[PDB]
Amino acid sequence: MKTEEGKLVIWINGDKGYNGLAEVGKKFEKDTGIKVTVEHPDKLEEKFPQVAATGDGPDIIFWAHDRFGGYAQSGLLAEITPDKAFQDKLYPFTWDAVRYNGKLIAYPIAVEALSLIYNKDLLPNPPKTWEEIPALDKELKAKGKSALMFNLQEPYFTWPLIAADGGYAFKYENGKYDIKDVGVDNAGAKAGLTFLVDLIKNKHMNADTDYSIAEAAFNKGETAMTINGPWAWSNIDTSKVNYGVTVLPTFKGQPSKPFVGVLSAGINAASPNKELAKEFLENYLLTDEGLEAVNKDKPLGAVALKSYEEELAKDPRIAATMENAQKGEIMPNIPQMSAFWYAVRTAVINAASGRQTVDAALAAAQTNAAAVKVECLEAELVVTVSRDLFGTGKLVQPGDLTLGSEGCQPRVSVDTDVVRFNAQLHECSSRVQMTKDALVYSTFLLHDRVEVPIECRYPRLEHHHHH
Ligand SMILES: OC[C@H]1O[C@H](O[C@H]2[C@H](O)[C@@H](O)[C@@H](O)O[C@@H]2CO)[C@H](O)[C@@H](O)[C@@H]1O
Ligand SMILES: [Ca+2]
Ligand SMILES: [Ca+2]
Ligand SMILES: [Zn+2]
Ligand SMILES: [Zn+2]
Ligand SMILES: [Zn+2]
Ligand SMILES: [Zn+2]
Ligand SMILES: [Zn+2]
């Protein structure tokens, strides 16, 4: 077990202020002898639920509150025990974010929202509207520069624009999310995405741009604007690029609705140090002195500790962050939330690459989120289709569903709640895509006219040998 006794192990996403948390670590060793080890695994949002299945993994996991409901469902999270004294010390807004089934399942740390960052030297007046940007780009290209570059590979980043004209994740009727009602296929969503597809088509943005491309492009000086969070400031500051942080553009008059996220720290249900951890977080990290350590390394954003948030909220950058939170909505923490993220991730990618039409793409994003769970084994993958597609109570027969290319003959288990596909990867895949580090296998599940994309990533070191 990573988790030993008398020793703390923390997992935090690589982009956050990990070394600064390490300083808050060492200040906890010099006071208690308990060593704190902080590490930053890749895809750690996905690594955590696998290892902690078997009691493995860290004592404390740091991530945006949205994944924690899923974690807690699968019984991999400790319920935290903070007293009345402490609960008053953070913003109620943030406690409610870390709650699930009426239990607190993590400690809220900071509030994050995507603002629009811009180069005052290249563009002393940011655009107020999305519709301005194509034009703006032309003029800018003529000067050897570009208008806007941001991470098109994650959904987090393109959502503010989809939601804008009335996209949403899961409908919230009567204080409960209807998990069969996804607002990714509606007209407002189609509007947002189409506009974004055209930016790509008109060479105003490239479909390939990812987090590290966009970040360099801007920090070098090659792009006017970018979309990103508080954590990206640390670097921008270093490039000495003269920048400001303002409200995201509007679309069809309406504002961009970023998802607001609450950086939360969660205690492992299998950890033998649940009290030592409880102490680290409550009295060393969640303090005016401790938060400063991290926020110094990589800005946390609008920190949830009332105390320091107030001392800090006189920053125009956080000022913008908060304005954008306002026009946002907050992330659901339900389990299905990660199916959503995958659905949409694929949709955007397929639309922007022309693999699917925006209509078909977002049509699929619905079924995928509402009724599909994909699970990728070594040389076979498992596709679990919920029998009731959209809540109708009208179930489908196994003959309505079709997986992979023609030669793909999967074994079909059929319960009364699901229909299960167990399929031979190589034999069923419709296309494999090689990247510097990854291999993505892709195939389609058809139902009705609709085609939902089934998609499995692996690293490229699985070739050596026998795939
Ligand atoms: O892209 C989907 C992804 O978005 C969010 O993750 C954010 C995270 O919240 C940010 O703080 C930052 O680290 O960038 C991430 C996006 O690349 C969700 O929290 C996550 O569950 C979701 O999969
Ligand atoms: Ca829908
Ligand atoms: Ca720093
Ligand atoms: Zn790392
Ligand atoms: Zn144009
Ligand atoms: Zn083969
Ligand atoms: Zn292998
Ligand atoms: Zn062989």
Swiss-Prot record:
Keywords: Periplasm, Signal, Sugar transport, Transport
PANTHER family: MALTOSE-BINDING PERIPLASMIC PROTEIN, MALTOSE_MALTODEXTRIN-BINDING PERIPLASMIC PROTEIN
Any Pfam family hit: SBP_bac_1
NCBIfam families to which the protein is assigned, alphabetical: PRK09474.1
Gene that this sequence comes from: malE
GO biological process: carbohydrate transport; cell chemotaxis; detection of maltose stimulus; DNA damage response; maltodextrin transmembrane transport; maltose transport
One annotated Gene Ontology cellular component of this protein: ATP-binding cassette (ABC) transporter complex, substrate-binding subunit-containing
Sequence similarity: Belongs to the bacterial solute-binding protein 1 family.
InterPro entries (UniProt xref): Maltose/Cyclodextrin-bd (IPR006060), SBP (IPR006059), SBP_1_CS (IPR006061)
Top-rank taxon, per record: Bacteria
Subunit structure: The complex is composed of two ATP-binding proteins (MalK), two transmembrane proteins (MalG and MalF) and a solute-binding protein (MalE).
Induction, as annotated: Induced by maltose and the transcriptional regulator MalT. Permanently repressed by cold shock in a PNPase-dependent fashion.
CDD domains: PBP2_MBP (cd13656)
A GO MF term: carbohydrate transmembrane transporter activity
Function in brief: Part of the ABC transporter complex MalEFGK involved in maltose/maltodextrin import. Binds maltose and higher maltodextrins such as maltotriose.
Subcellular location, principal: periplasm
Protein name according to UniProt: Maltose/maltodextrin-binding periplasmic protein
Originating organism: Escherichia coli (strain K12)
Subcellular location: Periplasm
